[PDB]
Structure formats: C-alpha cells, structure tokens
Design a protein around this ligand. Structure first.
Ligand SMILES: O=C(O)CCN1C(=O)/C(=C\c2ccc(-c3ccc(Cl)cc3)o2)SC1=S
Ligand SMILES: [Zn+2]
Length: 728
C-alpha cells in the first residue's frame, strides 16, 4: 500500500492541472478544493491532464473567468444532476468541452455539508470522464450498455427513475450499439450520473439501493478497470508510445548490441517461415516416384488442402491407388513450411514428438534450444513498473468452430453477441507453448484478427527486443484471463482480452487438478475403480481452460444421449486395454495414444476426433471445426461409435480383434444405405456406422428420425449391436 505516493502523486497531479484563483483566502479555499477532488479516482485527474484539461477554482459568476468567455452564450444554461435547468452565471460548476477542456468550480468549503453541490460537481466531472476522456478510446461501450439494459429491463423500475431520462425510459427495445451511437450524449449522461452518485459518499448508498448494477459497475471501474482506461488512453499519445518503446529499447540495449549474426538469423526465420522450394522437392524422388507424380491426378486426394494441393500441382507442371495415396502422405510431410512457432504449437512444446522426419525434428530442436538461450533477459527493469504488451490474434487459432460465426454475417464490422458470450464462457486461463510476438504499443489488426490481447507481463518474463517495436517472448508462458469484452476500434468491433502473465506451473496445476476432479467424478458415475486414469487433458495452448471445461460438458452430453449400460460395458472394455479419453489442443499426430502405434510417420492422422483401436482411446482436438460436425459433443459421440464398432465386433469372433463393421451383413447394409445419411458417413463402413450411431444419439430428435427413415436397416442394425453388447 505504498499509496502515500498515490496521495503525493495525487498531490503532484493537482499541482499541474489545479489552478487556484480567489480573493486572498488562498488556503481555506485551496485546501477546500483539495478535499473536494480527493473523492475522485486519481487516475481520472491524470487522464484529464493527458487530454490537456485544467481545473480552475474561482470566485463569483464563473462565466466571468477567462476560459469561459469564449462561450457561445446559449451554452450558458446547463442542467444539474436532476435535470432542472440553471444559469451558468448562477451555477457553481461547468466543464467546458472541446480540444482545450476546462473545469471551473466556484470556491466554497461547504462541499462537505452541501452534498447536493458536491454531487453536482462530481456529475460534471463524471461528464468529463464519459464525454472528454472515454470517448477518445471509444468508451463507454457494450459492457456499459449491458448495465443500462439490466436496469431498464429489471423488476424494479426505481433504478431507471434514478438515472434514466424519459428518452431512455420510453425507448422500446434494449439499447443496441447503434443506439449508443446516435444517442452518445444520452449514454454519456447516465454514465456521469452514476459516476456522480458513486463518488459523493452520501449518495453512494442510494445508488447501491435503487441501482445495484450501476453501483457494482462504477465500483469495479473506479477501483481497478480505470487504470486500464488510462493505459489505453496513453496508448493513443504519440510521445507516450515512443517514450515507452525507448525505455524498453534501452533496457535491452546491451542484449541487442551483443546479438550475433546467427542470433539475428534465428529471430528472423522465427518471424518468417521458410517455404519448401520445388527444386528440392523434385530432387528427392526416384524416377519411379517422379512419374507417379506426373501420373497421379493430385486433385483427387482428400487429406490434402488447397495450398498443399496447389503447390503439388506445380511440381508436375514444373517437370485412388492405395500406394499413391501413400506417396502423397509422404509429400504432405515434406511440403510443410519450416515454421518453428508452428512446430511448438502443434506439439504443445513436446518437441521430441515423432510426428515429423527425424532430420527436421533435430533442426527444430536445435533452433528452439538456441532461441530459448537467446531470450534470457527478463523485462523487469528500473525504467518502469507494470508493463502492457499487445497481440492481435485470429480467433480460429483458439476455436475455429466458434470463429466460424464470430463476425456478424451481414455487417462484418460487428461481433456477434451470441458467439461472443459462448467464446467468453469458460475462458479463464491460457498457455503459450511457442514464442509470442507482441507489440510494445497496440497496433491495428489484420482482417481476420478480431482478438486484441492486452497482456500484463511479469517482471520475470523473459523476452527479446525487436527494432520494429515488438518483443519476442520466451515459450511456456502462463496466462490468467482477467476480462473479456467487446470494444470498438476504428469503425470496427473487436474482442479485447485482458490477461496477466503468471508462472506456467500455476496453470498446469489447475489443469492437473481438473484432470483429478473429472476422473473422480466419472469413475463414480461409471463404476470404475477409484483411481483409474480414464480422462486425460493434454492442454498446452492459448484456449487452455476451454479444453478443460468443455470436457465436462461433452461427457455430460455423452451420458445423456446414450444407454448407461452401453457406456459402461464399452468404457470398461476401453479401460481394460488402458484406453483414454484424451481432450487436447495439440494436433493429434502428437498424441502418443496414436503415434506409438503407427508403423510409419506419414501414416498419421489429424482431425477433430480419432479413435485408436490399438490404444483403445478416443482423441478429441479442441481448436478445430469438425468436418461439419455441429460441435465437440457430436464429434466425441461419433468417435464413441468406432469404440462400439470395436467392442461389438470383439464380442463377435470372441477370440479375435475385428470390427463388427467388417461383417458382410453390415457391408451390404452400407452398400445400400451408405449414402442416405451424411457425405462424411458415406466415406466407408466404420464411418457410416459412426455417423449413423451419432445421429441416432443426437440431441436433435429430428436427427434421430432422419436415420430411422433414411437408413431403416442400419438403424435396426445399430440397435441390434446395442442390446447385444448390453446383454453380453
Ligand atoms: O478425416 C476425417 O475427417 C475422419 C477422421 N476420423 C477417423 O479417421 C476416425 C477413426 C479412424 C479412421 C481410420 C481408423 C483406423 C484405425 C486403425 C487402423 Cl489400423 C486403420 C484405420 O480409425 S474417427 C474420425 S473423425
Ligand atoms: Zn470416424
């Protein structure tokens, strides 16, 4: 609480902006305004200074003062907190708006006694805050709009009565962003009004009494969130942005002047991946390979994407058979860009993962250990205290599935509130397994980047300084999420995510305890031995907590749509083989439940979900959008289909390990109905079975019906397998 400095700083701040100009009693008056302004959060006084504003404590008819003479006379008739018209040459306060803002307060000492006046002064200050300060950083916005609606659409109308004008009282629907746009003056007024009631200690109770939400809002805002407001406000100031950059630049001056050529080379290839060059791709294929290249109709594969498809296409132009699919599986590995940061993210930092050829694995490890040694100097310095860094991010990176509907379908400048709430839901902690490249001062994002992180670094956080005003951070950072809200920047809506850096171990302990909890819970629900390790969280990336919290939801859906005894028999079977329900955010090829049972590396599979018979495990990737699989639940249940196809076919030739989807009986059922369900289900036997199984146990009962009337024989089949397994 080295707050005495906050008083001394509030003292020094007053020093500049506060200009006393009275009779001669300059002491009883001067120290009177000190008591009046002390009630205000220090940080709003500094914001006012930032925008060049000044405070004058004068005597008599305030409209007389120099700064208010240039006042179009009509502006000489204001309104008090209560909305009753008054006359500036009769009032005691006024806040001149404009590019040279001014606050004029008629001296007094009874601000202590006359609560009404102080109240009014605070209201004018509240007005300065919402009309002169926050507007320069596009606030108030959605968050505050929510408070306003909470109030208008609340049981007791008293809240409205206390803070709303009839203009807002009578407004039909809630206050949209568009409303706050053409009624700016209006919202700013309510803000100031609530700010006022909150600041004047006598009225605080009334505010909390009839308008709790407004109270809680202004409470949190004046205690913590205002500091960030000041921060964002300083971020628009040129000299402020440059001063910050300079202190950081010189803190790392020695680190820089000492970086070698190899040093710089490393940081650079870490910023720009090296794309594969045709010339080499070709000179790595024996003629046999080479002609099967010119022969194979690239555009016929499946596992290959556009760029991958395209790139390959130029390999022919430069010079589905089971074997040739095996040829492409290889090329897919060799045509991937050398992207250090991508490698860390894909593996969650598990760089020994046998998901790529040994030669490149080693080159990635060599470059990574080297980068890890380069970024040895922590940010902590004597040139500054708390330090904020910024990062513009593409939401698909966290959740493609939600990223799909983030932007408003009709108006791309808007963020869809529904998806926003869902995205914000269980976002509490995050992890960085690669090197975050952040900006010293916030900068404009790319079109696909509607996520703007404001990260508070630890003085411990290690980083590297880049000449262009960015920092490369050490890998393995821990991040707690402090606030997620919609903001507007340059005619465009973004999702501001306020995060604080903490030790990665703190977050891991949270995940690790979560794993313990979820297994304790489901081992009991399923009747498994107390300590079986069934569910496993392999979490290492930026949407970390979501992977964790979605697991509970996924398994709950899983249990509420399937026969309890079907679950038990099957999961006991899985457990018997050391199976696992793996929820991860690293690509599947790096989960060993899959890779330790591969013959070749290229035989790897990455997708939304995957069932591995050898390990009897279900793997579910969080970040991606399952091939048009509504959500994670559908995907997990789909994978459970394969699980069943396994346990049923096992109860078939008991003495073996074959799938019940291989039976001639089903193959024929597929031969006829294999196209009635989904395209993905059309893929093959087991897939058709899994898709069918999935729809049958969908939450959408209409879904179930589709199978029943478009795959009747299949429907009756899956059911046969169910009773089979249940009674066996
Ligand atoms: O590409 C896709 O989108 C489908 C990925 N996917 C699958 O590929 C699924 C399971 C799966 C596929 C193939 C196999 C398989 C499993 C073992 C062996 Cl030896 C051979 C193939 O399991 S579940 C799922 S989703
Ligand atoms: Zn499948």
């Amino acid at each position: 609480e080295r707050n005495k400095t906050q008083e001394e700083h509030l003292k020094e701040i007053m020093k500049h902006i506060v200009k006393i100009e009275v009779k001669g009693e300059e002491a009883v008056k001067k120290e009177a305004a000190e008591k009046l302004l002390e009630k205000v959060p220090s940080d709003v006084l500094e914001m006012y200074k930032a925008i060049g504003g000044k405070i004058y404590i004068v005597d008599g008819d305030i409209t007389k003062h120099i700064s208010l003479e240039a006042l179009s006379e009509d502006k000489k008739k204001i309104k008090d907190i209560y909305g009753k018209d008054a006359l500036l040459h009769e009032h005691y306060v006024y806040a001149k708006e404009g590019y040279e803002p001014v606050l004029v307060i008629q001296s007094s000492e009874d601000y202590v006694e006359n609560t009404e006046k102080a109240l009014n002064v605070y209201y004018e200050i509240g007005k300065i805050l919402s009309r002169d300060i926050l507007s320069k950083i596009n606030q108030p916005y959605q968050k505050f709009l929510d408070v306003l609606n909470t109030i208008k659409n609340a049981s007791d109308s008293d809240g409205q009565d206390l803070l709303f004008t009839n203009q807002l009282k009578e407004h039909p629907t809630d206050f949209s962003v568009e409303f706050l746009e053409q009624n700016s003056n209006e919202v700013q007024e309510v803000f100031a009004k609530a700010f006022a009631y909150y600041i004047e200690p006598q009225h605080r109770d009334v505010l909390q009494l009839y308008a709790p939400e407004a109270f809680n809002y202004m409470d949190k805002f004046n205690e913590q969130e205002i500091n960030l407001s000041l921060e964002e406000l300083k971020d628009q100031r040129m000299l402020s942005r440059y001063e910050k950059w300079e202190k950081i630049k010189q803190h790392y001056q020695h680190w820089s002047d000492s970086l070698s050529e190899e040093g710089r080379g490393l940081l650079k290839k870490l910023q720009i991946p090296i794309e594969p060059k045709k010339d080499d791709i070709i000179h790595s294929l024996s003629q046999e390979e080479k002609e099967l290249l010119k022969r194979i109709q690239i555009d016929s594969s499946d596992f290959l994407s556009t760029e991958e498809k395209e790139f390959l296409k130029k390999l022919q132009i430069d010079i589905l058979s089971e074997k040739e699919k095996e040829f492409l599986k290889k090329l897919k590995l060799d045509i991937q860009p050398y992207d250090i940061n991508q490698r860390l993210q894909d593996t969650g930092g598990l760089i020994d993962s046998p998901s790529i050829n040994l030669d490149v694995r080693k080159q990635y490890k060599r470059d990574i250990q080297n980068i890890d040694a380069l970024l040895h100097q922590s940010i902590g310095s004597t040139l500054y205290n708390k330090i904020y860094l910024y990062e513009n991010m593409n939401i698909n990176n966290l959740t493609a599935t939600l990223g799909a509907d983030l932007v408003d379908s009709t108006d791309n400048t808007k963020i869809n509130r529904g998806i926003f709430n869902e995205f914000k839901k269980n976002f509490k902690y995050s992890i960085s397994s690669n090197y975050m490249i952040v900006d010293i001062n916030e900068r404009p994002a790319l079109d696909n980047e509607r996520l703007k992180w404001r990260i508070q670094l630890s003085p411990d956080t290690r980083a590297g300084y880049l000449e262009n005003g960015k920092l490369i951070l050490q890998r393995n950072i821990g991040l707690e999420i402090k606030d997620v809200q919609i903001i507007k920047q340059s005619e465009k809506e973004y999702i501001r995510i306020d995060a604080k850096v903490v030790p990665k171990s703190k977050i891991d302990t949270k995940i690790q305890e979560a794993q313990l909890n979820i297994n304790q819970e489901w081992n009991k629900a399923l009747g498994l031995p107390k300590y079986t390790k069934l569910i496993t969280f392999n979490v290492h990336n930026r949407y970390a907590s979501n992977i964790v919290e979605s697991a509970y939801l996924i398994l709950n859906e899983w249990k509420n749509n399937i026969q309890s005894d079907l679950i038990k028999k099957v999961t006991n079977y899985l457990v018997d083989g050391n199976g696992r329900f793996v929820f991860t955010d690293i690509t599947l090829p790096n989960i060993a439940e899959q890779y330790t049972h591969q013959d070749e590396i290229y035989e790897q599979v990455h997708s939304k979900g995957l069932y591995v018979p050898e390990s009897r495990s279900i793997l579910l990737h969080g970040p991606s959008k399952g091939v048009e699989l509504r959500n994670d639940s559908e995907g997990f249940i789909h994978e459970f289909g394969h699980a069943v196809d396994d346990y049923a076919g096992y109860l078939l030739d008991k003495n073996q390990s074959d799938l019940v989807t291989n039976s001639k009986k089903f193959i024929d059922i597929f031969k006829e109905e294999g196209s009635n369900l989904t395209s993905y289900g059309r893929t093959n036997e087991a897939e058709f079975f899994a898709e069918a199984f999935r729809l049958m146990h969908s939450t959408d009962h209409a879904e179930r019906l589709k199978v029943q009337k478009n795959a009747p024989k299949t429907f009756q089949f899956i059911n046969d397998q169910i009773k089979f397994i249940i009674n066996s």
